Structures are given as structure tokens and as C-alpha cells.
């Protein structure tokens with residue numbers, strides 16, 4: 001073997017070397033103490049981890065049997081609730097309480113704004129995401145469909161001034177609505193000066209100041225003719241860049257070159273559903289990127305931005321963070337990984353490893369980067385998103401795991417904070433108890449609605465055929481789940497203490513649609529919501545300038561807008577819901593999305609890909625969207641909506657279409673015509689045909705097996 005013996009563990013040499021040579025130096029942790037701690041924490045917590053997974057299986061078996069024993073009309077909700085209560089699925093609601101989490105940075109406790117999620121194994125994307133704390137509004141408007149490409153306003157190879165003027169006018173309207181002038185419009189501004197600590201905007205006839213002078217936050221250059229003006233609205237910064245010599249500035253009435261928005265306030269560096277990491281080599285690539293981010297010296301085929309310097313309105317130099325405040329999303333409780341095996345050859349639980357290793361690495365972001373000031377949390381916290389938890393015992397386990405890791409690392413208790421994903425049904429219906437179990441560590445709750453939809457289908461798999469995938473988004477259960485999450489957070493005192501977050505916008509090119517509709521999330525009292533790209537971060541920032549999330553949350557206090565009956569409304573399809581063409585469209589759409597995602601996962605180790613759907617809309621796919629598609633098809637197959645020939649025909653029909661979409665790259669192995677020779681095609685087939693048998697419908701068991709299979713065959 002190429003393994004290292006520490007107690008009962010056998011550690012892959014690449015991981016042992018990375019920890020000793022790269023992660024531990026600078027933390028003052030004795031390497032011998034660290035590895036003995038790994039051994040002891042793994043030994044002590046693995047039994048409870050396994051017991052929690054077995055409890056999931058026990059509950060699901062009882063629910064399967066309950067549906068198979070019934071024949072009655074729709075579900076008697078009264079009997080169903082009583083059943084869930086007796087089996088320990090629906091637990092009592094605890095008494096009211098307020099969270100006690102302390103030592104948390106303002107970006108989380110106070111600032112409302114976008115949250116970006118990026119795969120940590122892609123160093124270039126991760127750097128762009130950390131740098132996405134500031135983003136050009138002109139770039140985001142000019143380069144997307146927010147400004148429609150109508151006659152004369154099209155994008156070309158060179159600058160289209162008619163389009164640029166549309167961008168400029170959009171941004172002037174944004175300034176008027178966000179930081180209004182005492183009189184007149186930013187559209188008519190001819191210049192900016194700082195006078196007696198106040199901003200003066202020259203108009204063609206008069207001069208004017210801000211309606212609220214307190215929104216003037218600073219400037220660069222001389223007050224007499226500043227190079228930029230810094231504004232603030234709803235806690236988010238806006239920077240007007242002034243340069244008449246620039247390509248855009250020469251066309252502008254005031255010499256304005258750009259408007260920069262504070263955009264991705266926080267970023268989640270993802271080890272979970274957006275990356276493919278099936279062995280120690282893969283995990284070390286991710287850990288090393290996470291280390292470079294926390295030490296400040298990650299650099300790609302591109303570097304991290306330093307902080308931004310300003311002058312205060314009344315004089316004085318100050319700084320603003322140039323980087324998004326970073327979370328790391330660990331994997332959840334299910335999977336093991338052979339990066340470490342025990343003496344019997346059993347793989348070690350991956351979530352326990354992630355806590356030890358990402359927590360160790362995060363110490364570097366609490367201290368000075370040599371490449372200047374410390375990178376991440378000035379208040380002394382480590383921010384870990386913990387996904388796919390099922391109910392409050394699983395949250396309490398994560399808390400104990402973090403407590404034990406803090407001890408190994410020499411950190412104060414409760415340094416390691418938890419972003420709780422509300423993305424499994426047994427968490428949703430016990431959410432108050434889940435928050436209480438983490439009441440001194442929780443820094444957000446977030447509706448991971450895609451995983452939640454997969455869990456909805458799997459939990460009630462035996463109840464009957466579910467509605468189509470696109471219908472799910474508007475079903476009663478999910479609207480109740482979204483309001484219930486906000487209600488629980490606000491009642492636990494999250495306002496001013498923790499984030500209340502909502503889910504990802506997946507249509508990466510439909511930015512006009514995103515700007516039109518994602519405003520719903522801050523209007524519902526979410527202090528953050530997930531975006532797929534720095535560009536979408538800048539555009540979603542617009543929504544927090546329009547919506548006073550703090551005011552909305554205060555207006556929601558005390559309201560209880562979702563009942564348990566609503567939360568438990570299973571999304572079963574009605575009698576004769578679909579024509580044959582609608583059933584075929586659903587199968588074809590789901591098969592193409594499964595194939596387009598899985599082929600890059602298995603053959604190239606890419607955990608997130610833009611995959612065009614049956615309507616040619618580019619969707620960002622990750623494991624959760626796969627969980628939905630495979631579970632829905634497994635459910636339709638289980639209840640006779642479609643046949644096994646329908647499934648095979650759809651996969652074979654969509655496969656060469658996916659081959660075409662990928663013809664452009666060197667590492668692509670086509671699936672057609674020899675389908676059963678493609679490990680990726682077989683993986684996609686297995687996710688559907690074995691989907692009903694996977695634990696809680698999770699995709700990782702199959703995906704990890706098939707990726708490792710592919711790696712092994714490519715190695716011989």
C-alpha cells in the first residue's frame with residue numbers, strides 16, 4: 001500500500017503529505033497530536049454516524065410500508081400525521097428560544113445580499129468567486145439579455161454605442177431609485193465634487209446633494225475632482241467610477257466610466273454537490289485550493305484581490321474588503337471515502353474527514369496572509385455549510401463533531417459555525433428543533449429546494465405517481481416549506497444575528513428573467529439567496545437595493561404562515577393528468593439532463609455543468625438536479641406511467657444529442673452508438689433503474705462507484 005498507519009487508520013499518502021507539508025505549518029498544531037486526534041475522533045463518532053444512517057433507513061421502510069398497506073382515496077392527513085408522530089419522524093415542537101451564536105462577521109449578521117456558490121476544485125472559478133464581492137454593473141448589463149438585443153442594440157464583435165447608451169440609462173435609473181438626489185436626476189448629472197464633507201452633483205442648471213446625505217460613503221482622488229464616488233444603500237456599497245478619457249466615459253454626460261456594485265457578499269466554496277471527488281487525489285486537489293484561498297496565495301492559469309482604499313466623506317483613509325467572506329460546504333453524513341480506510345479495509349466517513357481537514361485549513365483564514373491582512377473572518381469564526389441533514393439528532397451530531405474537531409485543533413469551542421441546509425423533509429417538519437440543536441453555532445438556514453424536491457419524491461415514492469418536474473416548483477408543499485423556513489428563522493431571532501437564505505437560480509443565461517423574478521426572495525424576507533456566477537451576483541444585488549429586507553423581516557415577525565398539513569401535502573398527480581406527448585416530453589427532458597450531467601461527471605470528474613434542456617435553456621446541473629430527475633423517472637417507472645422500454649429509448653435518443661453538445665472537447669468519449677460500452681451511459685441508466693433503491697434517493701453511491709470504475713479502466 002501507499003498508506004500511512006496512524007492508530008487504526010491507514011491514510012492515503014497524498015493526503016498525509018498534503019496535511020503535514022501544506023496545511024499544518026503555520027497553525028502551531030503538533031502533527032503527532034493532529035493525527036492522533038483524527039484517529040480518536042473517527043473511532044469515537046463513527047458508530048453514531050452509522051446509527052443515524054440506519055435510523056433513516058428504518059423510518060423510510062415504515063413509510064414505504066404505510067403507503068403500500070393503504071388503498072384509500074387521497075391520504076387521510078389526520079392518520080398520516082399520527083403515523084409520522086408515532087414512528088418518531090414528526091417530533092414535538094420545542095418551546096420558543098433565541099439563538100446565541102456570537103463572534104460572527106457583519107456580512108452574515110447584518111448585510112443582506114447575494115451568496116455565490118462555486119466548485120472548490122476549480123481554482124479559476126473559485127478565485128473569480130472570492131473576487132466577486134465587487135462587480136461591474138455595466139459589464140453585467142451589456143453582456144447579458146437584461147438589455148434586450150433588439151434591432152440596433154445587438155451585441156457584436158465591437159462596442160455597440162446604442163446598446164452602451166441603454167446600459168448607461170439603466171444604471172442612471174438604478175442610482176435615482178437607490179440613492180435619490182435632493183432634486184433632479186442622475187441622468188442629467190454633469191460632474192461630482194466633495195464639498196464640506198458632502199457630495200455635490202452638478203446639474204446643467206443647478207447643483208444638488210443627496211436626499212439622504214448619509215448615503216455618501218466616500219471617494220477616491222481629490223475631493224475637487226474625484227476619480228470615484230462611493231455610495232451606500234441598504235448596507236450595500238455602490239461605486240461610480242469617473243474617467244472622461246475612457247471608452248465609455250467619453251460618451252457620458254458626467255464622464256462616468258462604470259458603476260461597480262458590492263455583489264457577492266459571501267461565497268460558499270463547495271466540496272459537495274458541485275464537485276466530483278471520489279478518492280484522496282481528488283480531495284487533496286480541493287483541500288489545496290481551500291488552503292490557497294485561506295492563505296491568500298491561490299493563483300491560477302489570476303490572483304485574489306486586495307482590499308479597496310477610500311477616503312471618508314470627512315477625511316480619513318479607510319478600507320473595504322475586496323473579497324467575499326468565504327464559507328466552505330462540507331459533504332453530509334452519508335458517504336465514505338477511501339482517502340482513509342481502517343485496518344479492516346473499511347472506508348472512513350467523508351463528513352468527519354471534511355470537518356477535520358477543512359476546519360484545520362480554515363485556521364489560515366483567521367490570520368495574516370503573507371500575500372497583508374488576514375483573509376477571512378476578523379471576528380474569529382470558521383463558517384461551514386452542512387448539507388443533507390435529516391432532523392435534529394443529525395444536527396446535534398454535527399455540533400458534537402465540530403466540538404470534537406475544535407478540541408483536536410486547539411480552537412475555542414463554537415469557533416466552527418454551521419450553515420444549516422433545510423433540504424430534507426425530516427428537517428423541514430422539525431426545523432425549530434434543528435435550529436435549537438445548533439443554537440450556539442448556527443449562522444444560517446437555507447432552503448435547498450432542489451435536494452428538498454428529491455427528498456419529497458423519494459420519501460413518498462410508494463404513495464403514487466408524482467407531478468412533472470416543472471410543476472414541483474409551484475406545489476403547495478414547497479411554497480409552505482419556503483414560508484415555514486423564514487418563519488422559523490425569524491422566530492429564533494435570526495434578524496440581526498444569522499442569515500435566512502433561499503435557493504439557486506439555475507438558468508445561467510436567462511438574466512432578464514432572473515432580474516424580473518428573483519426579487520421574490522428578498523421580498524419574502526430572505527437576507528440572502530444563491531446565484532451561479534459573479535455576473536448573476538451583480539444583477540441579483542439590484543434586488544437588495546429595491547427591497548428593504550430588514551424592514552420586510554420586521555414586518556414578518558410573529559406570523560405563522562404554513563401549517564404542518566401544508567408541509568405534508570405530498571405532490572401526487574391527479575387522475576388522467578397527462579397526454580402521451582406530455583409524458584414523452586417529461587421523459588426526454590429528464591433523460592437529457594441526466595445524461596448531459598453524468599457524462600461529464602463520470603468521464604471527466606466535473607461536478608457541475610451547463611446542460612441545455614429539451615427547450616435549449618442552459619441549466620447549471622449538479623447532484624441535486626440529478627437527484628430530482630432520476631427520482632422522478634424512478635417514480636414514474638414504479639407506478640406504470642412509463643415502461644422500461646420508454647426509459648431505454650429516451651436514453652438512447654438523447655445520448656447522441658449530448659455527444660453533439662460535447663463534440664468540441666479533447667477528453668470527451670461519445671456514448672453512442674455503443675451505449676453499453678460507456679461507463680457514463682451505464683451510470684445514467686443505473687441512476688434511473690436503481691433509483692428507487694438508493695438511500696433517500698441519493699446519487700453519490702452510484703456516481704462515486706462509476707467514476708472510480710472509469711478511473712480504474714483509464715489506468716490499465
Ligand SMILES: O=C(O)/C(O)=C/C(=O)c1ccccc1F
Pocket residue numbers: 117273274423447448449450451452503504506532608620621622624625
Ligand atoms: O437546492 C439544493 O439542494 C442545493 O444545495 C443547491 C445547489 O447545490 C446547486 C444547484 C445548482 C447549481 C449549483 C448549486 F450549488
Ligand SMILES: [Mg+2]
Pocket residue numbers: 273387421423448450451624
Ligand atoms: Mg442541496
Ligand SMILES: [Mg+2]
Pocket residue numbers: 234548
Ligand atoms: Mg430604502
Ligand SMILES: [Mg+2]
Pocket residue numbers: 060692693694695696
Ligand atoms: Mg429504500
